[PDB]
Amino acid sequence: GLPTMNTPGSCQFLTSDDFQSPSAMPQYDVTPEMRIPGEVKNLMEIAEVDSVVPVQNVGEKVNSMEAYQIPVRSNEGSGTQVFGFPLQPGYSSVFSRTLLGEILNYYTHWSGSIKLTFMFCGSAMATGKFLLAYSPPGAGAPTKRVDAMLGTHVVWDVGLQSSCVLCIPWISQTHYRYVTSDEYTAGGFITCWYQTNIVVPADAQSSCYIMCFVSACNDFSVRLLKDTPFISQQNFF
């Protein structure tokens, strides 16, 4: 009879504990593993892949394939805004449904860089230049191409290589940010303007589209496992 003493925390059930337990089927021979292609070892390999972003999620576009498309055209001006949205990868309506955004909805903290790739989907005769800009929080959304230039920007020239990559870096005071909408840990703003104007010849379409893909860099991380707010079960199916 070895003398022992029970500490607080006995005979309790923890949703997240790591103990051994007696097997109910002793001396069971499992099937020998075969090599199935494409093994996942971490969730940050599912997040580093591109996913089309629904930027035009306005009105009834969400019930159509039109949501993904960004409409660009030829106008008698310059410096007009194409699109803009905030940098909230888990919470913004724009990113909530993408692979990386859905992965973030299972975590509380996120920290890293963000890649944004744009592919031009117009004619092979149409040409133009765009200004892709990222503005850090402190002063509101830039309302002009001139205010946007003062922030991190990339001038994209459409040619043989249709795609372009704007890499939003980690500028934060803290080490991590909040996936949920918060005001202390604010993200920034991402806007797109016309660096020049869309140039189209005759007998070609002057109304084109762009597509946007979002992924993570090699320095992305997440923490605090939680429950996604998206799924809802009325009753046992």
Partner 1 sequence: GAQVSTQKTGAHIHYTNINYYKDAASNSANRQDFTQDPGKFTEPVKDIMIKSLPALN
Partner 2 sequence: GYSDRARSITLGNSTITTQECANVVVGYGVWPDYLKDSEATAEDQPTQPDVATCRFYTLDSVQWQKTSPGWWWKLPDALSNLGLFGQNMQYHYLGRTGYTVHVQCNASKFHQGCLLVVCVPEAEMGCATLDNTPSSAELLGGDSAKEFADKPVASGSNKLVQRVVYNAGMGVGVGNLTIFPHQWINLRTNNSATIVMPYTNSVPMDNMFRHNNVTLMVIPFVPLDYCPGSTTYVPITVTIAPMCAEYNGLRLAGH
Partner 3 sequence: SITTPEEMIEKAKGETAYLPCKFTLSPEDQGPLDIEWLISQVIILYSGDKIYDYYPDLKGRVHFTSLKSGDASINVTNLQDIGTYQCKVKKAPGVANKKIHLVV
Nearer to partner 2, 104 or 208 (CB): 208
Among 1, 77, 159, 229, binds partner 3 (CB under 8 A): 229
For 135, counting Cβ atoms within 10 Å of its Cβ (0-12 exposed, 13-18 middle, 19+ buried), the class is buried
Per-residue burial over 88-111, b if 16 or more Cβ lie within 10 Å, else e, is bbbbbebbbbbbbbbbbbbbbbbe
CA distance 28 to 186: 53
Binding segment toward partner 3, per CB under 8 A, in 5-13, 128-136, 174-182, 209-217:
174-182
**What DSSP state is assigned to residue 25?**
S
> Residue 140, interface with partner 3 (CB under 8 A)?
no
Q: Which of residues 11-30 bind partner 1 (CB under 8 A)?
A: 18-23, 26-30
Least gap, CB of 10 to partner 2 (angstroms): 37
Q: Please, what is the minimum distance in Å from the beta carbon of residue 207 to partner 2?
A: 8
Residue 224 binding: pick among partner 1, its own copies, partner 3, none (C-beta 5-8 Å cut-off by kind): its own copies
SS3 67: helix
Give the nearer residue to its own copies in terms of CB position, either 17 or 203: 17
Q: How many residues bind its own copies (CB under 8 A)?
A: 33
With binding defined as CB under 8 A, does residue 228 bind partner 3?
no
Q: Copy the structure tokens of residue 147.
A: 């205010």
Q: Classify burial at 148, counting beta carbons within 10 Å of its beta carbon; exposed 0-12, middle 13-18, buried 19 or more.
A: buried
CA 200 to chain CA centroid, Å, is 32
- In eight-state DSSP terms, residue 202 is T
**Window contacting its own copies (CB under 8 A); options: 5-13, 96-104, 177-185, 192-200:** 5-13
d(CA 31, CA 65): 44
Q: Which is nearer to its own copies, 13 or 236 (CB)?
A: 13
Residues that bind partner 3 (CB under 8 A): 178, 180-183, 229
Residues that bind its own copies (CB under 8 A): 1-14, 16-19, 21-22, 24-26, 28-29, 31-32, 175-176, 221, 223-225
